[PDB]
Amino acid sequence: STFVAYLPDYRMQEWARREAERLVKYREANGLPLMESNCFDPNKIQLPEDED
Amino acid sequence: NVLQIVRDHWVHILVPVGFVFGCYLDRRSDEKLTAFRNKSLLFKRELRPNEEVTWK
Amino acid sequence: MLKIIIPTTMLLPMTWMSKHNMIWINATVHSLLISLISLSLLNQLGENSLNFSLTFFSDSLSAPLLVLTTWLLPLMLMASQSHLSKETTTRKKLYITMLILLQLFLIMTFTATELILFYILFEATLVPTLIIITRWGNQTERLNAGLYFLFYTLAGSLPLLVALVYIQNTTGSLNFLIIHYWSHPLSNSWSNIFMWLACIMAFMVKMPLYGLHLWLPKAHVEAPIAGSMVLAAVLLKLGGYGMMRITTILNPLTNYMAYPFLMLSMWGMIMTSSICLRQTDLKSLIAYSSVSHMALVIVAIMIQTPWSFMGATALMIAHGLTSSMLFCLANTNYERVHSRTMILARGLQTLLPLMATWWLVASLTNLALPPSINLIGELFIITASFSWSNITIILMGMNMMITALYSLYMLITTQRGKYTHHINNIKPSFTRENALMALHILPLLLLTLNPKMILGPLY
Amino acid sequence: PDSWDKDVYPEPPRRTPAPAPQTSLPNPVTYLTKIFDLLVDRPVTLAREFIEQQHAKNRYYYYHREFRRVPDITECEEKDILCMFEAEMQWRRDYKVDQEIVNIIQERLKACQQREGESYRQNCAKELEQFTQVSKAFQDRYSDLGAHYSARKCLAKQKQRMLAERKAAKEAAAA
Amino acid sequence: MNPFASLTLTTLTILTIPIMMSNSNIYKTNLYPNYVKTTVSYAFTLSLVPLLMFMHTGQEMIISNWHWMTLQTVELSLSFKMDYFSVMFIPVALFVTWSIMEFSMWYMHSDPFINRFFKYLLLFLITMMILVTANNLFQLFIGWEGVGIMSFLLIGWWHGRTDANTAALQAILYNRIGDIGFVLSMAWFLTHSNAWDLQQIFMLNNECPNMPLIGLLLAAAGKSAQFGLHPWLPSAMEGPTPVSALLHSSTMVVAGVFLLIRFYPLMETNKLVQTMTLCLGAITTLFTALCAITQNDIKKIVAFSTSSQLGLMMVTIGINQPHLAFLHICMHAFFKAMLFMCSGSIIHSLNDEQDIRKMGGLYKAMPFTTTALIIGSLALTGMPYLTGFYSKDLIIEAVNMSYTNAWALLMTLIATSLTAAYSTRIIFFAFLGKPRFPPLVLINENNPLLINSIKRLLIGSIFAGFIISNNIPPMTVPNTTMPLYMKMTALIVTIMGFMLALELNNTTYYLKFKYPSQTYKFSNMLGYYPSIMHRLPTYHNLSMSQKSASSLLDLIWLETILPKTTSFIQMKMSIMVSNQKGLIKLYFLSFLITIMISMTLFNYHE
Amino acid sequence: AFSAPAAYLTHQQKVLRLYKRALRHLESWCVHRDKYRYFACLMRARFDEHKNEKDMVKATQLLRQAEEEFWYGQHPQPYIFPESPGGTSYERYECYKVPEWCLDDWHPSEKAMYPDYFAKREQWKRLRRESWEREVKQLQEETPPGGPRTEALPPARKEGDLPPLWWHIVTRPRERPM
Numbered sequence A: 001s002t003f004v005a006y007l008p009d010y011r012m013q014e015w016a017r018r019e020a021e022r023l024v025k026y027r028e029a030n031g032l033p034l035m036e037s038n039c040f041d042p043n044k045i046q047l048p049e050d051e052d
Numbered sequence B: 001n002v003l004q005i006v007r008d009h010w011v012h013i014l015v016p017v018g019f020v021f022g023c024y025l026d027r028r029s030d031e032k033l034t035a036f037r038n039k040s041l042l043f044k045r046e047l048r049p050n051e052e053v054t055w056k
Numbered sequence C: 001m002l003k004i005i006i007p008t009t010m011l012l013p014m015t016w017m018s019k020h021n022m023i024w025i026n027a028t029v030h031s032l033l034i035s036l037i038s039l040s041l042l043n044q045l046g047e048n049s050l051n052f053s054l055t056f057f058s059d060s061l062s063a064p065l066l067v068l069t070t071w072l073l074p075l076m077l078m079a080s081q082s083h084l085s086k087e088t089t090t091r092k093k094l095y096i097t098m099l100i101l102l103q104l105f106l107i108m109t110f111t112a113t114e115l116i117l118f119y120i121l122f123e124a125t126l127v128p129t130l131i132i133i134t135r136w137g138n139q140t141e142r143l144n145a146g147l148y149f150l151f152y153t154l155a156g157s158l159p160l161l162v163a164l165v166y167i168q169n170t171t172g173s174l175n176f177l178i179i180h181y182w183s184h185p186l187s188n189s190w191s192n193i194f195m196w197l198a199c200i201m202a203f204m205v206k207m208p209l210y211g212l213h214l215w216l217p218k219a220h221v222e223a224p225i226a227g228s229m230v231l232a233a234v235l236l237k238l239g240g241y242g243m244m245r246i247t248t249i250l251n252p253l254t255n256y257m258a259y260p261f262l263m264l265s266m267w268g269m270i271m272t273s274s275i276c277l278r279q280t281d282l283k284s285l286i287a288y289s290s291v292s293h294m295a296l297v298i299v300a301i302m303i304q305t306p307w308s309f310m311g312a313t314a315l316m317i318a319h320g321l322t323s324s325m326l327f328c329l330a331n332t333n334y335e336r337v338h339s340r341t342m343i344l345a346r347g348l349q350t351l352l353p354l355m356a357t358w359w360l361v362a363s364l365t366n367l368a369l370p371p372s373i374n375l376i377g378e379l380f381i382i383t384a385s386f387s388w389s390n391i392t393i394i395l396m397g398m399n400m401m402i403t404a405l406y407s408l409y410m411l412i413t414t415q416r417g418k419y420t421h422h423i424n425n426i427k428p429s430f431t432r433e434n435a436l437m438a439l440h441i442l443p444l445l446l447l448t449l450n451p452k453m454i455l456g457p458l459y
Numbered sequence D: 001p002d003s004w005d006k007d008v009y010p011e012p013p014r015r016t017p018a019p020a021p022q023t024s025l026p027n028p029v030t031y032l033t034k035i036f037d038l039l040v041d042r043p044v045t046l047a048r049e050f051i052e053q054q055h056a057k058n059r060y061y062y063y064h065r066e067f068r069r070v071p072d073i074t075e076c077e078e079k080d081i082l083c084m085f086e087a088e089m090q091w092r093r094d095y096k097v098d099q100e101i102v103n104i105i106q107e108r109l110k111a112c113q114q115r116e117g118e119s120y121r122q123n124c125a126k127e128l129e130q131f132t133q134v135s136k137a138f139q140d141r142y143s144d145l146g147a148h149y150s151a152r153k154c155l156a157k158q159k160q161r162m163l164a165e166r167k168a169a170k171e172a173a174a175a
Numbered sequence E: 001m002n003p004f005a006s007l008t009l010t011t012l013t014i015l016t017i018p019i020m021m022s023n024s025n026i027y028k029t030n031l032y033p034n035y036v037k038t039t040v041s042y043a044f045t046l047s048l049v050p051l052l053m054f055m056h057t058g059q060e061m062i063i064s065n066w067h068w069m070t071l072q073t074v075e076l077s078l079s080f081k082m083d084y085f086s087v088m089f090i091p092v093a094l095f096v097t098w099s100i101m102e103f104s105m106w107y108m109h110s111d112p113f114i115n116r117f118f119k120y121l122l123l124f125l126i127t128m129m130i131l132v133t134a135n136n137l138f139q140l141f142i143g144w145e146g147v148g149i150m151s152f153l154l155i156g157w158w159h160g161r162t163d164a165n166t167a168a169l170q171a172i173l174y175n176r177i178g179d180i181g182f183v184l185s186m187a188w189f190l191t192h193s194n195a196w197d198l199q200q201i202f203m204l205n206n207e208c209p210n211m212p213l214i215g216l217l218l219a220a221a222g223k224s225a226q227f228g229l230h231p232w233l234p235s236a237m238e239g240p241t242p243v244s245a246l247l248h249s250s251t252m253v254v255a256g257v258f259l260l261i262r263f264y265p266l267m268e269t270n271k272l273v274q275t276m277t278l279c280l281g282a283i284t285t286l287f288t289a290l291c292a293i294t295q296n297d298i299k300k301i302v303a304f305s306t307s308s309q310l311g312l313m314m315v316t317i318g319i320n321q322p323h324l325a326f327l328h329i330c331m332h333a334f335f336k337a338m339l340f341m342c343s344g345s346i347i348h349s350l351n352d353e354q355d356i357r358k359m360g361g362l363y364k365a366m367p368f369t370t371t372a373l374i375i376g377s378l379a380l381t382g383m384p385y386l387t388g389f390y391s392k393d394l395i396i397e398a399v400n401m402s403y404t405n406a407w408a409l410l411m412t413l414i415a416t417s418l419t420a421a422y423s424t425r426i427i428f429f430a431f432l433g434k435p436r437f438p439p440l441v442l443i444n445e446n447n448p449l450l451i452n453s454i455k456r457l458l459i460g461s462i463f464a465g466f467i468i469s470n471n472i473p474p475m476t477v478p479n480t481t482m483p484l485y486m487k488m489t490a491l492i493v494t495i496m497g498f499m500l501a502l503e504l505n506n507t508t509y510y511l512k513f514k515y516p517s518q519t520y521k522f523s524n525m526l527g528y529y530p531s532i533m534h535r536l537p538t539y540h541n542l543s544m545s546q547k548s549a550s551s552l553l554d555l556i557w558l559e560t561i562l563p564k565t566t567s568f569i570q571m572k573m574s575i576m577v578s579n580q581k582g583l584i585k586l587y588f589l590s591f592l593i594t595i596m597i598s599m600t601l602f603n604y605h606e
Numbered sequence F: 001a002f003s004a005p006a007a008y009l010t011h012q013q014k015v016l017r018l019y020k021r022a023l024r025h026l027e028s029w030c031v032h033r034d035k036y037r038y039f040a041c042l043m044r045a046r047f048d049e050h051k052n053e054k055d056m057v058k059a060t061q062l063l064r065q066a067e068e069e070f071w072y073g074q075h076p077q078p079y080i081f082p083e084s085p086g087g088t089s090y091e092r093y094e095c096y097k098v099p100e101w102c103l104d105d106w107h108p109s110e111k112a113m114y115p116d117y118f119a120k121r122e123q124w125k126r127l128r129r130e131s132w133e134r135e136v137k138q139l140q141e142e143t144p145p146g147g148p149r150t151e152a153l154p155p156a157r158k159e160g161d162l163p164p165l166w167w168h169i170v171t172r173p174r175e176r177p178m
Ligand SMILES: CCCCCCCCCCCCCCCCCC(=O)OC[C@H](COP(=O)([O-])OCC(O)COP(=O)([O-])OC[C@@H](COC(=O)CCCCCCCCCCCCCCCCC)OC(=O)CCCCCCCCCCCCCCCCC)OC(=O)CCCCCCCCCCCCCCCCC
Pocket: E290, E293, E294, E413, E414, E417, E418, E421, E492, E493, E496, E497, E500, E501, E504, E505, E514, E515, E516, E517, E518, E519, E520, E521, E523
């Protein structure tokens, strides 16, 4: 139980906290919406020709 | 007198020897999958002056 | 992963080359050491699994199951060495060999990288359990129990073999990583419906699904204590592990092919919990508890949501531990009164107070008392089902009521009231049985402090 | 404390009123607080200063891990397993980062409700506004992937949403 | 740091030290009950200070000191809410528990497992503090289930008695019925609001829908024993008198009311749920008060009084007056616990006799018990300037000055009269007249433990209403303008109850006999609710569980379809194949038939 | 609880049972003592009004009407003695009753405490052992060949005899074992 309690954080939770803190700080400083509803930018998505 | 103990204690070491052998076999099995060592786009890196491989 | 497999294999020559009065000590000590070694597998990553080699890997779902499987063998050895006292040395060593083979097969099953090796070991687990039930069982119904247990599984899983072989021919591989990365949908065809059915029923039989569970009240009751513990704790979880693995190929056919199974499981939890309310046999009540609890895991797997998957993993671990503890508790009384009737030996709190405490703790854990991991799994699955459909809450709440009802019924009938006047051979509780109860119950409470270790890869 | 960036976790200037007693009776909480300060706070401060003196003799640092930016799932061919693997790992890391951002915004919302007091409905409209937009973005990103999610399924969801938006604009411009 | 957080966490953490020492060499000594009582008294003294800080500046906090697990976006933490309700309720509960433990040192003196009894009482107190101070729904659920399990373990204290086990299981069932709604509320608040924390739930729900509030109402009705789920509270009197005084009288049974009070910012925006709560509280406070006026077991009478007070509390919640409900909880705790201690003293002094029909003239035999019970009844009946006057009369006034269901108003007034009715009965049949107990007089109330424990809550029941009501800040707009006849409604109805009950009781001395009417039989048998709902649904469920689920479905038809059918078919096919008598004359003809069939069927079209 | 029951209740026994039950329920209705005295004297008069009839059919019909009277006029909440089957302290002390055979499972260290009591227990066990066959012989002598007709047991008729089947009746734990 002592070994399990002190397992190194290989699930990377504090790393995610710090990365999120950095991105939130950057996006709050420069007026960004803190998240966009598009994971991948449309500049490299190739949709079909037209709707019909 | 090692007689009346070794004949009773040699089975007491069968499992730790197996564990050591398993660790050694795990290292040898790991030695066969070094095709992309220091070649991944995420961990590609220039070697240190004295080291030869990033991981073994 | 060989650092765990090789010691488990070495357990066999040590058992066979041991003196007749030292087999149990060596087996228990080295099984506990192997469990301690296997504890190192809980160090999982956040993104991908632990690919040890081309043959074995480990993820966040396999590690808790592996730790439970390694931890269970010492308890089975502890519980078995009472009723096997009059056995011959060769028969004792054969029993321990069967248990070790079972552990080795389960360990290699939970880490197999491909589905064919997984199937091979997942069915290789049948012969040791079948031998145990049909050879060291106590009554005359053990033969029928073994036949039922063997044939349900084989009839359910041969089409799985055919489907897996077809999938490898159409896709080129059955490696789980390649399958997961190269996933592709199923067209809504009859052939795809039957390929869905073949890939699913093999695990529904072993959950077991309601209506396909007839083999369980026979196998879990007729088997000896170690056989019952391994059947309830680990062998029921093979179906859940296989389903959570294999639904990767299945989507999106599952969105509507899961309706009959969801209906069957959500009504069968009610049916089995009601069956538990009128049971003249204690072991049969504990066996039906397992079906009632695993119906919820079936629901969680079938609704395909991360919260349901996490709750299913937690519930599988908690159910394994609790069912093993309850079976051991019932065996302690059976070894005294030599009968399985519940109302035969009553008022046992007056005679055995510490066993009464163990019974109370096991009953509280069974009925999902907060903040047990049983509660964590069941509540996560309940929330996932509520998100699936709000009307599921009626069945979930009714099941929670009936579960507590029959759990406290079993507690009160056996431990309360006045002791039977004529059972005058109830000796005080042995140190071995108390230690068995403690080693069953302490991990349950300790896992509440770090529940992320048993929440699976979706955490 | 400087243990956290105070722009990621904003806090009002903490205006507190002056103690202006208007009665002649002694204030019991004042005497109790003096007893607390001199009886429990001071020994704890002494112990913590001893611990800090011990820590100052051994100073080592742990560094935050930085990851390079690898090509994502859109630049990978249909059956290129290595690029697919790297893109999927990067997508998983981005998913975790987005979850942590949502956690940060939720923490602000909870802190704001308690801090404001009874005027919270009007006092922290901004926190509610920030959480609504972040929740909407996170939902549009990861809402319905279910279990067995991957970068490919998120890409397919984004493509379907883009097709729907393009069609909506198509019949919007025709009016 | 300021002392508020440290003291609020310390008053909770020092209640667990005697639990840790339950395996040391103090648990095997007769000093353990004194140790636990001293710990509780010290905890009360320590908790008195955060109350003073709130009384000064209204200081309030939330303390999330430990992070448990993070599931994706959601964060579950060990968070404590130290607001007005918690810091006001902890000292009252600790005071009542201290008095009950000092009483238990005398009442449980001959119990071979008194140390265990004390450990159990302490465990219940810890679970109650967990329930009250919880900031998230999971922690509050942990407390909710802990108090229920401790109720189960303490009701069935004498585990050789069948009825104690029956009552414990009945309480467990009736609380699981509301646990269903609790789980419904948790699930709805998690999927819809994405958090289990109070701060987030309030923020995201400005117009709360029906389902979560109806689930909360169901859970509160289950815990507080409302009309649908009431009968378990009277049955919970199987346990020792201290258990009935502490758990089922003043602290546990108010948990549902506390839960509804904690969610008042969401109940303000819903009117249908408020109407349902009002109607449920009104019917409960009518029905239990009507049942109490014909009961002969004193513990049952006081239990029905407690249930009626809980119904009144639910009525107070249902008219959008939650702070008044919390105030009524705090006031009612004192005198109801004291009433149970007086009843237990009477029971102990009369050799375990609980029926008032065998209690005679105790006014002079037990002067201190009579004084305490008279003061408690006066407080209970809302006598002016008593601790009950500062809550119950204001409740009645608020119900009179609100847009209210008229039937609920009338039922509340009738329950107010019936309170004085039943209170008069306890005094009339317990303390006035000639003795009716066995001749061997063992009456003795000259024990310092009993006297001091009763006296503390006596002083409380006298002065606590005035002390508290003039010290808490005003969170309510008052009813400053009232007609004079409506300002004095509660007093008038209590006086009428006193007079009518006294007249009908004095009628008993007359040398006249008459058979009971049907109204008396309905009232005395609890409206036949246990006579029907404890027999019909249980019988039907237990008979369908065996006839249909066990025998017909599991043992017959599920067996018939899959395994028995295939076994029969394989047996028939095996017999069909295996009975040839070994005569070549038959299967050589079969060979010829096969050869002919093969050529035409498989040969003439390749 | 101490007497072997008969095959049936006679008319006198039924009437006496009804009289006692009616008196108890009337006392339940009449809380005060003097009123109960008045109405109990009236009840005694009502029972004595028909004590001397020699017709069994009319007496049985009177008994039926009296049972119907009692069942219509009974108290729904009659007084019950605390230790009675319906009392509030009926089985309160059954969990503290431990059978005597549990003392044979004690550790020798536990029997080091209380040596004199265990010597007395040992001589009691010797006395129980020395008398069993005589009890069995007496039981198989004094019963009819076609099995016993009543649960009543015989006493010890000789001088060196103990009453048959006495051990579990004599070694009752207690009412208040703790
Ligand atoms: C401010 C301006 C407004 C003024 C308002 C009014 C002013 C004053 C008016 C006063 C009016 C009378 C008040 C006293 C009431 C009667 C007292 C009494 O007990 O008399 C005994 C007498 C016979 O007793 P017994 O059987 O000879 O007793 C045997 C021994 O003595 C047994 O002896 P024990 O030692 O067991 O002791 C028995 C015990 C228990 O006594 C009983 O056995 C009877 C208890 C029940 C009646 C108590 C009243 C509760 C009324 C609640 C009604 C709610 C609506 C229910 C709707 C149900 C619909 C089905 O005695 C007591 O508890 C004391 C008497 C009650 C004390 C409280 C009285 C005052 C509160 C009520 C008046 C409030 C005044 C202020 C109001 C302010 C706001 C307006 O029964 C009655 O007189 C009451 C009957 C009234 C209810 C009848 C309901 C109809 C039942 C059949 C209906 C048809 C059904 C057809 C089939 C349908 C199937 C679906």
